[PDB]
Amino acid sequence: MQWSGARALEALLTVAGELRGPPLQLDTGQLLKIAKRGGVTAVEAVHAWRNALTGAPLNLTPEQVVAIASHDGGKQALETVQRLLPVLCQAHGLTPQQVVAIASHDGGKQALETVQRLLPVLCQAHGLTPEQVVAIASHDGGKQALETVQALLPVLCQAHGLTPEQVVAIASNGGGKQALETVQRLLPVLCQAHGLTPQQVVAIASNGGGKQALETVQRLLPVLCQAHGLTPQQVVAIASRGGKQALETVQRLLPVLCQAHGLTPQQVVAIASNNGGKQALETVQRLLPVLCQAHGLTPQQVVAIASHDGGKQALETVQRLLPVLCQAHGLTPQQVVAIASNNGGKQALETVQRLLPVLCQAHGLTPEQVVAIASNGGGKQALETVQRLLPVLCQAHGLTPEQVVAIASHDGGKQALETVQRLLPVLCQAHGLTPQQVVAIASNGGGRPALESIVAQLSRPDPALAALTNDHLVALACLGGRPALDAVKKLEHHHH
DNA sequence: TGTCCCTTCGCGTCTCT
DNA sequence: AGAGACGCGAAGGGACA
Hints:
By secondary structure, this protein is mostly helical. It has one domain (1-496). The protein has helices spanning 8-19, 28-37, 39-48, 50-54, 62-69, 74-90, 96-103, 108-124, 130-137, 142-158, 164-171, 176-192, 198-205, 210-226, 232-260, 265-272, 277-292, 299-306, 311-327, 333-340, 345-363, 367-374, 379-395, 401-408, 413-430, 435-442, 447-459, 470-492. α24 (401-408) packs parallel to α26 (435-442).
């Protein structure tokens, strides 16, 4: 590709064509993902070692090879997985998937070598679990984070009062090293000068860019409180959810948004308190006029659309599509606002646009049912999964369309549908649950984990405490999902 | 032009009652 | 049942070789 070379392009494109063949069978999206991030050396490395990565002792799926290859240094990560996967699984007890997750970030090589070197000491001397070490390692710069937990976990616990879990949370994001050092430096001043609790500092620091959010809360908390009238809680929420950039934008736009456009401080805070809050704030300031007059909506509706991650994208997509969705497809504004007012609003809107007619015509759903599916977070995903799975769920597993639609009409609908497909046969035929009981467990937020937690308990039946008969577990699962089930595991281990 | 590390923003899912 | 928590990842920026 790179034009300090030529007809090297034929050689390169021919390498890519061959990956479409066996043992990987990569499709265009997969090659694209590799070329976009691992680059041409990752493309070449995947091709040179396609047999070794896909055979024993590694046995990686194509998708796992793609996940490793598609990051800066992917060639090194691929090399290093081949060397260390077996020892990490066998000697350190990790699964192949955990090794892959570690490997699948920029500088994956470094992270893999560092888990090898440090996992034991982190577990034995600092008391972490292997899962915790995996979570710290599985981000860009995971080497740095691992080494920084090793060096700092003791002072942060003993001098500053944090639990190991808190330290793990601060560490387990990109730039975990920086967030950890910055908490070490600034936790005292933030608690003593600005009146924050330890937990609030942890919350601010426990997201990508935590260092920056922390330094910015230090700098801007006084101004935002004593000049613009926000409370400390509100500053924390902004810092925690929208970071540095949202804090700076709030400082700039609070006056304009409140005085000129008529918003409450609460409303500005709510827009600010999400990933991309800066973008959401700047986009409501631009678009509030056109959205509210020029027919359209109330400020309250614009505020609701803006008040989710990707608010900017949702607002802009609502601007573009509200006319065509109401006029050509027959929806009301209110329905468009519901579809738009979740994370991924943009995506849900766009997917309703091209799928509303396919879902009614090719599968017999009504428009109202399509709106319901689309009006939760991940609407795009749920819609595409109903399109794909409705045939098989009805005709093989014997469910009704209304049942499929119920499962799909919660956040994570895609996950619940796919879990039902996977687990309905074993739940019914082997354990005596009815289809209706599986549907009822599935038709809640957290459907997938609740179905998986109920199968896990039914199949092992673990600690043979059978006073929870099948129907009781079904009711527990319906009422409180996995957490209800895990809690009851927690609560039995010896009071009984 | 590759490798490593850090930050911002967007999407999707689950828990909290 | 929606707020806020959870996790995963694309994409872009700098440092340095």
